[PDB]
Write a protein that binds this ligand. Sequence first.
Ligand SMILES: N[C@@H](CCC(=O)N[C@@H](CS)C(=O)NCC(=O)O)C(=O)O
Ligand SMILES: N[C@@H](CCC(=O)N[C@@H](CS)C(=O)NCC(=O)O)C(=O)O
Lengths: 221, 221
Amino acid sequence: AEKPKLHYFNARGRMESTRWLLAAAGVEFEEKFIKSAEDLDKLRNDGYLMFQQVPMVEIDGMKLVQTRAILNYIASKYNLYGKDIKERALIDMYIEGIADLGEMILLLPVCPPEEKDAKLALIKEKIKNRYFPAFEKVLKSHGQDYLVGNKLSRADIHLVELLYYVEELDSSLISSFPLLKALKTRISNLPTVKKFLQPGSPRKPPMDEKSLEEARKIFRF
Amino acid sequence: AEKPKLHYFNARGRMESTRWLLAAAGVEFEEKFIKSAEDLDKLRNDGYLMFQQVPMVEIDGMKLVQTRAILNYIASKYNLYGKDIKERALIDMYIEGIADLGEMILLLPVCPPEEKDAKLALIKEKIKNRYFPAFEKVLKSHGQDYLVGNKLSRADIHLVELLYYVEELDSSLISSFPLLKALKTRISNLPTVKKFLQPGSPRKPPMDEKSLEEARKIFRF
Ligand SMILES: N[C@@H](CCC(=O)N[C@@H](CS)C(=O)NCC(=O)O)C(=O)O
Ligand SMILES: N[C@@H](CCC(=O)N[C@@H](CS)C(=O)NCC(=O)O)C(=O)O
């Protein structure tokens, strides 16, 4: 059928978790970068963005917007959303925790200059005291290589992605969590994920001041 | 069986959409209201809350936290999450838009007072120009009574709940959307929803200043 086509700007932002999930699933996809406000405005005008926002992914005849809609579909299509309703419940609880922490970190460079330092410290206390203990506890509960059902799921991929971002923020936050470190290593060594982590893949770099200014002139904030 | 048990404070907050969904489904439930910081410490120390937060719902032997994990489980169990993964994609896309708008409205009372006037204006412009147009377009395109699949789903319930909140904010905003007004009426007349809407149900009132102070006392924010 059609190769999925990912519409976003040339940055991580809200599309990166999708690039991770598709890559991990071994699914070939294409990207179409929005480079100007005019590119975005054409997509809006032409009715391809339900809420006038991206990310948008063209897949299986849909113009799918909303990150969780995109990810839920891709996870189901490629058997990374568990085997039944009860496994999906555990997966959803786990990844919604990942989303909450992820969202905090995502928005840190948006924080007013004089609130930024205190926001970082609150994120670090949450990582150390709430999120990393919760996920370490799951991995210690069963002692297995994957978070849910002894099988690779989206939860492992989303979690490992976030451990990369936490590492960029402060490399010591993970030090007291040996099962999380071991998960990061194993998932990073899955053939598909390894290729994703290697140069020339669609994986995107940390946003710098000049990619931030591009966001500003496209999405106008 | 055993009725779902909903752990939250006696208020709408992040638990109201689950009350709406269970009620719509015809599912009888129990609530255990958190009334003190001590009540919450106890849920936390007892290991009931994966990320130390509520909502939490005890259902079918699980202690489910995270709103979306709770709702996704309920919706699948009671056949309100569509017939296959493509209808689920449409439902997710729609309801995530509803979630974004809902979140703006939910958080409005905690907006810095200096920001409330401008933000309320932005929210009304997004209702009139972004969200209501998107759902009216979906309804106009297929001419059917329900958002997805010509059949009741969670999307119809979540949207109608939101239409009630928008009506609370400003009753004029829906005026130029006849299809949304018709959806509101039809759904509000389904026996389960009609009963939920009548005095005496578990439906909660608008958060006032004192319910908000209660929350500060309990969650120490
Ligand atoms: N809840 C949405 C949020 C999407 C979103 O905020 N997109 C931004 C780009 S990251 C956007 O298009 N902003 C333009 C606008 O809101 O008008 C999702 O997760 O997909
Ligand atoms: N993404 C979570 C958010 C949960 C949340 O923020 N819960 C609040 C109460 S509405 C809480 O328990 N706060 C206490 C805390 O975070 O320490 C969900 O949707 O369930």
